Amino acid sequence: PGVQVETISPGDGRTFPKRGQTCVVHYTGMLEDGKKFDSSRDRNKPFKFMLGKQEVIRGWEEGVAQMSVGQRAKLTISPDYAYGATGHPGIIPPHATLVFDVELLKLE
Template sequence: MGVQIETITPGNKTNYPKAGDRVSMHYVGSLENGTVFDSSRKRGQPFKCAIGVGQLIRGWDEGVPKMSVGEKAKFVITPDYGYGANGIPGLIPGNSTLIFEVELLAIE
């Protein structure tokens, strides 16, 4: 249970975000069946947020700090680290395992 991280492309292996850092990322989120439910790439703008401060799902708060700048990784996030039993009505069914391809662009 939790978040599994598989590196797709290594980053610089020196700059890692820590709790409270603001980061810039691209991501594509999908369900296990391949249905894409969200994508910063489709919107054409990186997603910017503070990491490790409870603004995001637990899988991201725990997974992103393990990435270095420039890294692209695949996160497999179990429901307890994602949106849980409730999901997001009309978008993510309850108890869904989530798949994210995340690219850490910068720590701001």
């Protein structure tokens, strides 16, 4: 599948992201073996995005939509739902499944 969502800690079970809302998260991105390539936690600066604008990889678009506020989850994202056969220069190999540890902090 494009994205698999595995819950580390549950959310509120009620408030799921909608278009027009700003999602505020912490994340760590890694390959399937846990090798880290990026993190907002390390910047002590949360990351913000919105649905419906093609502004995040599709695995986030579909994965974070399945999370409720407060949830921490592992999103396992297939290459086609991430950087595909290309990868990301300097960072992500071709054909890489990505794992993001995401905490959905709030909706703004």
